[PDB]
């Protein structure tokens, strides 16, 4: 399962602001091997950039531009890590 022992961060997974990058981490060295599914849905677009890490922690970051919450479905081996669905209320940038 893994989703039963995942520990994640989220400086920009609980709230973001257009023109500002947002990211999170899925620390789970315990679950060891076991990829993880992560995707977002909503009327907008963003630049995603992930990087595997022998630490099992999935480091990913993106910069959105159109305000609005983003349904982030985070599931391990297709399960549901603590609070899988994490919406992020996005706010305008500086314009």
């Amino acid at each position: 399962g893994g989703a039963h022992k995942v520990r994640a961060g989220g400086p920009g997974l609980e709230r973001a602001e257009a023109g500002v990058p947002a990211e999170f981490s899925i620390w789970t060295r315990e679950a060891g091997a076991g990829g993880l599914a992560i995707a977002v849905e909503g009327p907008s677009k963003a630049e995603i950039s992930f990087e595997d890490r022998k630490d099992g922690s999935c480091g990913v970051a993106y910069v959105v531009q159109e305000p609005g919450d983003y349904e982030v479905s985070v599931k391990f081996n297709e399960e549901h890590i603590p609070d899988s669905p994490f919406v992020v209320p996005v706010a305008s940038p500086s314009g």
């Binding site: 789970t28 076991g34 995707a39 992930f50 595997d52």
Partner: peptide, 21 residues
């Protein structure tokens, strides 16, 4: 509209099996 990316967790170095020998 709909996009994401798949990951692949994995350990760093290998490990000596049990001292079966």
């Amino acid at each position: 509209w709909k996009v994401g990316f798949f990951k692949r967790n994995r350990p760093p170095l290998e490990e000596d099996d049990e001292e079966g020998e």
